[PDB]
């Protein structure tokens, strides 16, 4: 009766789709009318970070929002400084291939990951001052896409195999292994309360996980190409999703549906990094056509163009307070907008 | 200057770090990076062993030139989402087994993979050093069975030289661009000694091409 089982599963999927249709009442664009449009957005360059000598793949901010972390093509993980233009550290990675970087919310540790299928965590506030490998987390099969720090002892990971794992820095073996996906997973973003997160796999589906229980909570379809980046809304009950279809999509947690589509005919190249600006009214998006965007998160109309790079933008993210934006493109430059 | 005493030392340390990265980039950018794609368990081990988890590198220097053979075929993931990391490699050592035409056939699967990796938009100027191994096994199997079983287009005779030429033309015709990149074939074998010499010759050719393009003389 396995055929009956799979057909019943398909019928249940049709039923949940019908429930989603019924749960729909209106559109976010329809709701947000009679509201003041954001208007033109002019965001000049405020800093440039001309330290790297190759491509730049990832970026993260500290809690104080003054120290950058940049994953390069040649392993040269740098901890920059924001207000001035210096280099607090320069970490020579073991494997040059690094596709993610994460700076711990406590300012102590920093992580990196790439094709080596190993996430290495570096310690900074060390007596006998020198950045050293605190732990080489291993256990993933495919490549590694994004790591994020819950605290100074736990870290989450989205790998190249169809899994996302919650690690343990003290004892290098995994605590939980989230597995509900099909195809590789490219990005993930933790909650502002560090209780839930979603990972965007290439199967055009995003899943809502739960760190404690370990079981998947919700699913999020509605796309046409593979997801490339996700960052929760500052509220903690929504998340945008990067795409290869050049279609940012703002999902939500209590309606489980898809709210808005930030798609225009002019844009055709894919998305690389999406980061909500603080207070949520701006949805940044690093495209492939050497150009970012300042998409108005409530009204579909774009607010402004943010383009000063000469090659593909590969990472971006707003400060903690919301004072600046740090783009890292495939060139050797990080640009601090404000 | 209105820079405090500690901030001045911070700037000095930042400049020292800048110098360190500049020196590292100078010493490492001249180094030669040879990506190795192809079909695993078909001669990769033999060719690697000839020259003395996930990705694995191999830093061997021959005739005073530091090489980096990057065996990435063991990644076992989506080949289109991590291949862009390998832009800027000076070569792509492909690997085909002449005996793997009698096992969707694996020979035509390897042909498809070769076509996909040659025509990829990330690798348009980077050369490809095609390899062909199992010479003795191919000789035995061409003495045993004909070449038409896997090749419907072929119509000649089951002679080793003609078949080898046919394979050369076939694998050097699947490239849609014959101007921006070259393909260096080589009928190596298991017990071989000249593969490192041939790879050195090909890498000298490609580095001469890169020098000509950089200087703008081309």
């Amino acid at each position, epitope marked *: 009766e396995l055929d009956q089982l799979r057909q019943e599963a398909e019928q249940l999927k049709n039923q949940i789709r019908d429930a989603r249709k019924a749960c729909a009442d209106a559109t976010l664009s329809q709701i947000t009318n009679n509201i003041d449009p954001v208007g033109r957005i002019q965001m000049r360059t405020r800093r440039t970070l001309r330290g790297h000598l190759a491509k730049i793949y990832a970026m993260h901010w500290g809690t104080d929002s*003054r*120290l950058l972390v940049s994953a390069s093509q040649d392993g040269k993980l740098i901890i920059w*400084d924001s207000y001035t233009t*210096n280099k*607090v*550290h320069a970490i020579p990675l073991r494997s040059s291939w690094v596709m993610t970087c994460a700076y711990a919310p406590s*300012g102590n540790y920093v992580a990196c990951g790439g094709l080596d299928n190993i996430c290495s965590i570096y310690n900074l*506030k060390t*007596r*006998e*001052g*020198n950045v050293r490998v605190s732990r080489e987390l291993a256990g993933h099969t495919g490549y590694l896409s994004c790591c994020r720090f819950l605290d100074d002892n736990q870290i989450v990971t989205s790998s190249g195999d169809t899994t996302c794992a919650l690690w343990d820095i003290e004892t290098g073996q995994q605590t939980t292994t989230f597995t509900g996906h099909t195809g590789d997973v490219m990005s993930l973003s933790l909650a502002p309360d560090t209780r839930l997160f979603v990972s965007g796999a290439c199967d055009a589906s995003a899943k809502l996980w739960d760190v404690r229980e370990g079981m998947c909570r919700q699913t999020f379809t509605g796309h046409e190409s593979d997801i490339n980046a996700i960052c929760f809304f500052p509220n903690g009950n929504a998340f945008a999703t990067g795409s290869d279809d050049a279609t940012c999509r703002l999902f939500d947690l209590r309606a489980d549906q898809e709210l808005m589509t930030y798609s225009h005919d002019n844009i055709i190249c894919g998305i690389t990094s999406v980061s909500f600006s603080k207070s949520g009214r701006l949805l940044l998006a690093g495209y492939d056509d050497f150009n970012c965007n300042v998409w108005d998160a409530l009204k579909a109309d774009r607010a402004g163009v943010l383009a000063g790079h000469d090659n593909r933008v590969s990472c971006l993210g707003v400060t903690d307070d919301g004072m600046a934006v740090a783009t890292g493109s495939w060139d050797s430059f990080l640009k601090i907008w404000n | 200057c*209105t820079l*405090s*005493a*500690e*901030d*001045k*030392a*911070a700037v*000095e*340390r930042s*400049k*020292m770090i800048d110098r360190n990265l500049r020196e590292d980039g100078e010493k490492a950018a001249r180094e030669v990076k040879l990506l190795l794609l192809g079909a695993g368990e078909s001669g990769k081990s033999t060719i690697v062993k000839q020259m003395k988890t996930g990705i694995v590198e191999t830093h061997f220097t021959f005739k005073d030139l530091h090489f980096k053979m990057f065996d990435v075929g063991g990644q076992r993931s989506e080949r289109k989402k991590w291949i862009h990391c390998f832009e800027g490699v000076t070569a792509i050592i492909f690997c085909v087994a002449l005996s793997d035409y009698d096992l969707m056939n694996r020979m035509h699967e390897s042909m498809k993979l070769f076509d996909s990796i040659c025509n990829n938009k990330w690798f348009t100027d980077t050369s490809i050093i095609l390899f062909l191994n199992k010479k003795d096994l191919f000789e035995e199997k061409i003495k045993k069975s004909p070449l038409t079983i896997c090749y419907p287009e072929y119509a000649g005779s089951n002679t080793y030289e003609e078949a080898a030429a046919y394979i050369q033309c076939q694998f050097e015709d699947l490239n849609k661009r014959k101007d921006t990149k070259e393909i260096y074939t080589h009928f190596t074998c298991a017990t071989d000694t000249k593969n490192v010499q041939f790879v050195f010759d090909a890498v000298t050719d490609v580095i001469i091409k890169n020098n000509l393009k950089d200087c703008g003389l081309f």
Partner: single-chain antibody
Amino acid sequence: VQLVESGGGLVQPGGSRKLSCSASGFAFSSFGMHWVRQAPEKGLEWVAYISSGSGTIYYADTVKGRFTISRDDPKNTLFLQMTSLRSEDTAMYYCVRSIYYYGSSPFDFWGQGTTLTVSSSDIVMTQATSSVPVTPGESVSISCRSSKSLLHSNGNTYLYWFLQRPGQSPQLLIYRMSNLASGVPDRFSGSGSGTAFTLTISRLEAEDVGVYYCMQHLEYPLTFGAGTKLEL
């Protein structure tokens, strides 16, 4: 992780010596190093400075052109050669390590050091307290003073606090104003405003007694303070 300054004794005045401090267990290249001396019963005197790679060197007023300091990076030693020692430069010296980046903590570890005996526009810091009595358990505060406003335009105010137990090398406590050095209890808390600062002690134990030298780092030659002796 440890510094031992060696070389010294009783040389005749106007002689010449070269000191040494065999660094072993930290990034000697990456950490800038200083030299601080102590008279028989006076306060600490800043002497010299070497940065990472010897890119910038500073000297005190009384040693400019007389003393010379260099680092031997491969050998892990640091040298302070001396020319024309007067009869007023008798002191037992300290080999200081330091580091400078955003959020660093200079003067964190201070070597035990060796002695040296010879026969026969300054940022003022006046520590008015001197041999102040205190009962073990009660909360007291060490006063401080200055003349040039240390509240720089870049926010942080550069001024430090160095406790010294008797017969022991001094240690960093507060690597800026209102911070806390690693391995220093939360009982201590810098609390100041502008150009008059205090060092609160929540409840002193039987071990946190001695002199609390408060030193400014806004501009060289890093004038120290007179210190405040602590008692029972």
